[PDB]
Scaffold this motif. Structure first.
Motif, PDB file in Angstrom:
ATOM      1  N   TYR A   1      -0.642   0.327  33.087  1.00  0.00           N
ATOM      2  CA  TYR A   1       0.657   0.269  32.447  1.00  0.00           C
ATOM      3  C   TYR A   1       0.675  -0.799  31.378  1.00  0.00           C
ATOM      4  O   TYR A   1       1.449  -0.707  30.430  1.00  0.00           O
ATOM      5  CB  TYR A   1       1.764   0.043  33.474  1.00  0.00           C
ATOM      6  N   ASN A   2      -0.163  -1.819  31.546  1.00  0.00           N
ATOM      7  CA  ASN A   2      -0.280  -2.902  30.567  1.00  0.00           C
ATOM      8  C   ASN A   2      -1.198  -2.726  29.361  1.00  0.00           C
ATOM      9  O   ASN A   2      -0.974  -3.337  28.320  1.00  0.00           O
ATOM     10  CB  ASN A   2      -0.564  -4.215  31.257  1.00  0.00           C
ATOM     11  N   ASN A   3      -2.252  -1.932  29.511  1.00  0.00           N
ATOM     12  CA  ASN A   3      -3.184  -1.692  28.414  1.00  0.00           C
ATOM     13  C   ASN A   3      -3.975  -0.424  28.659  1.00  0.00           C
ATOM     14  O   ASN A   3      -4.066   0.054  29.789  1.00  0.00           O
ATOM     15  CB  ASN A   3      -4.144  -2.875  28.261  1.00  0.00           C
ATOM     16  N   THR A   4      -4.552   0.119  27.598  1.00  0.00           N
ATOM     17  CA  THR A   4      -5.485   1.220  27.739  1.00  0.00           C
ATOM     18  C   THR A   4      -6.809   0.808  27.148  1.00  0.00           C
ATOM     19  O   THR A   4      -6.856   0.289  26.033  1.00  0.00           O
ATOM     20  CB  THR A   4      -5.025   2.434  26.976  1.00  0.00           C
ATOM     21  N   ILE A   5      -7.897   1.001  27.884  1.00  0.00           N
ATOM     22  CA  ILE A   5      -9.189   0.620  27.322  1.00  0.00           C
ATOM     23  C   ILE A   5     -10.289   1.653  27.551  1.00  0.00           C
ATOM     24  O   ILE A   5     -10.438   2.194  28.639  1.00  0.00           O
ATOM     25  CB  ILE A   5      -9.595  -0.819  27.706  1.00  0.00           C
ATOM     26  N   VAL A   6     -11.036   1.938  26.491  1.00  0.00           N
ATOM     27  CA  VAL A   6     -11.951   3.071  26.480  1.00  0.00           C
ATOM     28  C   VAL A   6     -13.386   2.653  26.209  1.00  0.00           C
ATOM     29  O   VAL A   6     -13.696   2.080  25.164  1.00  0.00           O
ATOM     30  CB  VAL A   6     -11.535   4.095  25.425  1.00  0.00           C
ATOM     31  N   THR A   7     -14.259   2.964  27.158  1.00  0.00           N
ATOM     32  CA  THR A   7     -15.660   2.598  27.074  1.00  0.00           C
ATOM     33  C   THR A   7     -16.477   3.848  26.855  1.00  0.00           C
ATOM     34  O   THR A   7     -16.245   4.847  27.500  1.00  0.00           O
ATOM     35  CB  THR A   7     -16.113   1.986  28.378  1.00  0.00           C
TER      36      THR A   7
ATOM     37  N   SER B   1      -9.941  -1.036  22.891  1.00  0.00           N
ATOM     38  CA  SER B   1      -8.730  -1.215  23.675  1.00  0.00           C
ATOM     39  C   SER B   1      -7.542  -1.429  22.762  1.00  0.00           C
ATOM     40  O   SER B   1      -7.685  -1.482  21.543  1.00  0.00           O
ATOM     41  CB  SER B   1      -8.863  -2.435  24.572  1.00  0.00           C
ATOM     42  N   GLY B   2      -6.368  -1.589  23.358  1.00  0.00           N
ATOM     43  CA  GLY B   2      -5.169  -1.840  22.586  1.00  0.00           C
ATOM     44  C   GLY B   2      -5.283  -3.146  21.827  1.00  0.00           C
ATOM     45  O   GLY B   2      -4.959  -3.230  20.642  1.00  0.00           O
TER      46      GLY B   2
ATOM     47  N   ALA C   1      -7.021   3.359  20.123  1.00  0.00           N
ATOM     48  CA  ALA C   1      -8.158   2.822  20.857  1.00  0.00           C
ATOM     49  C   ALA C   1      -9.174   3.914  21.075  1.00  0.00           C
ATOM     50  O   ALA C   1     -10.370   3.716  20.857  1.00  0.00           O
ATOM     51  CB  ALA C   1      -7.713   2.234  22.190  1.00  0.00           C
ATOM     52  N   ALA C   2      -8.678   5.066  21.510  1.00  0.00           N
ATOM     53  CA  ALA C   2      -9.513   6.236  21.708  1.00  0.00           C
ATOM     54  C   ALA C   2     -10.285   6.479  20.428  1.00  0.00           C
ATOM     55  O   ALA C   2     -11.513   6.593  20.428  1.00  0.00           O
ATOM     56  CB  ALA C   2      -8.649   7.440  22.026  1.00  0.00           C
TER      57      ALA C   2
ATOM     58  N   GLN D   1      -2.550  10.455  26.204  1.00  0.00           N
ATOM     59  CA  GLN D   1      -2.591  10.331  24.748  1.00  0.00           C
ATOM     60  C   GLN D   1      -3.962   9.858  24.311  1.00  0.00           C
ATOM     61  O   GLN D   1      -4.415  10.138  23.205  1.00  0.00           O
ATOM     62  CB  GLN D   1      -1.531   9.352  24.254  1.00  0.00           C
ATOM     63  N   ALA D   2      -4.613   9.122  25.195  1.00  0.00           N
ATOM     64  CA  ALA D   2      -5.984   8.713  24.978  1.00  0.00           C
ATOM     65  C   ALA D   2      -6.850   9.952  25.054  1.00  0.00           C
ATOM     66  O   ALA D   2      -7.666  10.191  24.177  1.00  0.00           O
ATOM     67  CB  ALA D   2      -6.413   7.696  26.027  1.00  0.00           C
TER      68      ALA D   2
END
Ligand SMILES: [Mg+2]
Ligand SMILES: [Mg+2]
Ligand SMILES: [Mg+2]
Ligand SMILES: [Mg+2]
Ligand SMILES: [Mg+2]
Ligand SMILES: [Mg+2]
Ligand SMILES: [Mg+2]
Ligand SMILES: [Mg+2]
Ligand SMILES: [Mg+2]
Ligand SMILES: [Mg+2]
Ligand SMILES: [Mg+2]
Ligand SMILES: [Mg+2]
Ligand SMILES: [Mg+2]
Ligand SMILES: [Mg+2]
Ligand SMILES: [Mg+2]
Ligand SMILES: [Mg+2]
Ligand SMILES: [Mg+2]
Ligand SMILES: [Mg+2]
Ligand SMILES: [Mg+2]
Ligand SMILES: [Mg+2]
Ligand SMILES: [Mg+2]
Ligand SMILES: [Mg+2]
Ligand SMILES: [Mg+2]
Ligand SMILES: [Mg+2]
Ligand SMILES: [Mg+2]
Ligand SMILES: [Mg+2]
Ligand SMILES: [Mg+2]
Ligand SMILES: [Mg+2]
Ligand SMILES: [Mg+2]
Ligand SMILES: [Mg+2]
Ligand SMILES: [Mg+2]
Ligand SMILES: [Mg+2]
Ligand SMILES: [Mg+2]
Ligand SMILES: [Mg+2]
Ligand SMILES: [Mg+2]
Ligand SMILES: [Mg+2]
Ligand SMILES: [Mg+2]
Ligand SMILES: [Mg+2]
Ligand SMILES: [Mg+2]
Ligand SMILES: [Mg+2]
Lengths: 101, 116, 87, 70
Positions: free
Chosen positions: B15-21, B34-35, B54-55, B83-84
């Motif tokens: 809920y605080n951030n989105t992060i994509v590896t 990430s955001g 980020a995506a 959305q990512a």
RNA sequence: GUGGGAGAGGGUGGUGGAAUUCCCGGAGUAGCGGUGAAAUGCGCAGAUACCGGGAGGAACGCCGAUGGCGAAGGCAGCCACCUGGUCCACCCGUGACGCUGAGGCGCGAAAGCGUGGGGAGCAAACCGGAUUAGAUACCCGGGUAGUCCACGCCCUAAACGAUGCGCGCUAGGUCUCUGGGUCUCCUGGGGGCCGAAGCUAACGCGUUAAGCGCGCCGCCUGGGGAGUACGGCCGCAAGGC
């Protein structure tokens, strides 16, 4: 004396002589705890749902015995002690409750 | 300098951030984002828009490694997780399959009072 | 546990006449079998309290049947007691 | 969307080694299905449960699975 | 008694997978985290996110129920042993052996105490960041006792159905768990919901009585003072009766 089922899952990477050696140890252990072997099903190579000791497969051994109940836990201890034995489950026998008649 | 061909992407969304590896077929990271990796700082990080950016960022960064195909793996339930995934579909990376790996226990650990 | 054979031996030992399953004697014998097994179980397993209550209740029954017998035919009561080794 | 028992023959509910039949009562994930989906009875479902959990510890049934699509 | 049954009832030993934490290795940059917004905090001694390996502790997702078991407190991964209660069928045995129960004895959630272990996550106290007029709080970052095991203490509670136990007697309907039956349904034993008669100040209760009766126990007699003071008993203490 009570009737039990002995489930044993061991190393699928085993060769003939060594596999039959683990089986020698299984037989000698069962018979050493007073267990009489009524029947045995050997399924062998099977694809596990999840890995066991990094292994995708397992070699299954099913037994049905009659043994002194005071000795069951120690029997399974003895079975487990082997490095090559990945899983052991002893189960009290049950009459096969059916469904969808 | 790799030329990793195909590979896979992890979207870890809270809920605080989105992060994509993004990683090779063996799971080893190639690039991430990430955001906060983009301009966002506060609450704004865990916005869905940031998730998009980020995506995308991670995807372009990946195509620098010459990526084509990717397997998406989603963890967490958070604002702009989907959305990512969405930006990641249109990212020009061909998305091969999406999956949900979000962890849940079998009731091991007492959560924080916030989580009871 | 107490198997069929054991129980039956106790009954055929304590029956007043052949076929007597339920006389005070047989009852007290059986009660005593269970009481001893349980009291043995509780020597180890000191922490099993529920089982203990079970034993309290068994002892209570036994005491009541004995109280009844003594009230009724004191001789049979002496006999029972000495045979079992109670009181 | 028929119930699982509805499509099957007579089968031993107590048999943990039969994977082919037990896999039917799991989810897309490794979750054991609700009664409404398995169409079993209270006692039935109650035994099925223990049987499945047995099969899992034995290695022939999943505890958990990844959810595809999404 | 014989023959069947269901069950997180209890005790001991094993054992399984998910997750968290930490450690090792790989790959990989510039943030992560967190909030209403933030900040403290953590990260270039390389964090977050990702893969692999390992150590450890605690709790058992789905099944799971408006469900089950237990006298209560309470009890849920799986396996074996040890063990308690209980229901049904058969109508076989004893022949009033019954009920209740002041005192006594035992059990008794959590917290708490003692000795020794253990310690992942959580977390009184505490230490910080915010908010606020202040903030000794709510929110955020840490964190000790504790939480967990053994042995021994403590005896409390909204320990609640706020409903003492047993027996008999008074329409039904509907759902459910578990036995038996000639298995539509009937017939036992539990759990629920509507309701006859009746009861109740009302709310409501109503074959799981708060109805009609009998037996026995506990208890009450305006509020505050006060579960206080005094005494006694118990307790290592907190404290309890
Ligand atoms: Mg081994
Ligand atoms: Mg944020
Ligand atoms: Mg019986
Ligand atoms: Mg049992
Ligand atoms: Mg149990
Ligand atoms: Mg137990
Ligand atoms: Mg590392
Ligand atoms: Mg730094
Ligand atoms: Mg520093
Ligand atoms: Mg440690
Ligand atoms: Mg649930
Ligand atoms: Mg009950
Ligand atoms: Mg029993
Ligand atoms: Mg008769
Ligand atoms: Mg007569
Ligand atoms: Mg009484
Ligand atoms: Mg207590
Ligand atoms: Mg406590
Ligand atoms: Mg202590
Ligand atoms: Mg806190
Ligand atoms: Mg403060
Ligand atoms: Mg301040
Ligand atoms: Mg914390
Ligand atoms: Mg201390
Ligand atoms: Mg009271
Ligand atoms: Mg009264
Ligand atoms: Mg009554
Ligand atoms: Mg029936
Ligand atoms: Mg009923
Ligand atoms: Mg009813
Ligand atoms: Mg009513
Ligand atoms: Mg009645
Ligand atoms: Mg009344
Ligand atoms: Mg007064
Ligand atoms: Mg007063
Ligand atoms: Mg007080
Ligand atoms: Mg005085
Ligand atoms: Mg005093
Ligand atoms: Mg003193
Ligand atoms: Mg006090």
């Amino acid at each position: 004396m009570r009737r039990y089922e002995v489930n044993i899952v061991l190393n699928p990477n085993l060769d003939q002589s060594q596999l039959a050696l683990e089986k020698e140890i299984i037989q000698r252990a069962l018979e050493n705890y007073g267990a009489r072997v009524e029947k045995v099903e050997e399924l062998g190579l099977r694809r596990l749902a999840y890995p066991i000791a990094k292994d995708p497969q397992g070699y299954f051994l099913w037994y049905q015995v009659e043994m002194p109940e005071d000795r069951v836990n120690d029997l399974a201890r003895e079975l487990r002690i082997r490095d090559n034995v990945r899983r052991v489950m002893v189960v009290k026998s049950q009459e096969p409750f059916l469904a969808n008649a | 300098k790799r030329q990793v061909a195909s590979g896979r992407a992890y979207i870890h969304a809270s809920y605080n951030n989105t992060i994509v590896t993004i990683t090779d077929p063996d799971g080893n990271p190639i690039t991430w984002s990430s955001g906060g990796v983009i301009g966002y700082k506060g609450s704004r990080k865990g916005t869905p828009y940031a998730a998009q950016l980020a995506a995308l960022d991670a995807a372009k960064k990946a195509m620098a490694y010459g990526m084509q195909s990717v397997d998406v793996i989603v963890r967490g339930t958070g604002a702009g997780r989907e959305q990512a995934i969405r930006a990641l579909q249109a990212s020009g990376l061909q998305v091969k399959s999406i999956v949900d790996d979000t962890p849940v226990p079998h009731n091991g650990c007492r959560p924080k009072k916030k989580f009871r | 546990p107490i198997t069929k054979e054991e129980k039956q031996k106790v009954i055929q030992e304590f029956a007043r006449f052949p076929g007597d399953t339920g006389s005070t004697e047989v009852q007290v014998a059986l009660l005593t079998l269970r009481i001893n097994r349980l009291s043995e179980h509780l020597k180890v397993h000191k922490k099993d309290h529920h089982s203990h209550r079970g034993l309290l209740m068994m002892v209570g029954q036994r005491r009541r049947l004995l109280r009844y017998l003594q009230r009724e035919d004191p001789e049979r009561y002496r006999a029972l007691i000495e045979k079992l080794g109670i009181r | 969307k028929a119930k699982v028992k509805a499509t099957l023959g007579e089968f031993d509910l107590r048999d943990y080694r039969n994977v082919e039949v037990l896999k039917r009562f799991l989810s897309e994930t490794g979750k054991i299905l609700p009664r409404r989906r398995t169409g079993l009875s209270a006692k039935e479902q109650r035994i099925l449960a223990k049987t499945i959990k047995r099969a899992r510890i034995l290695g022939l049934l999943p505890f958990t699975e990844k959810l595809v699509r999404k």
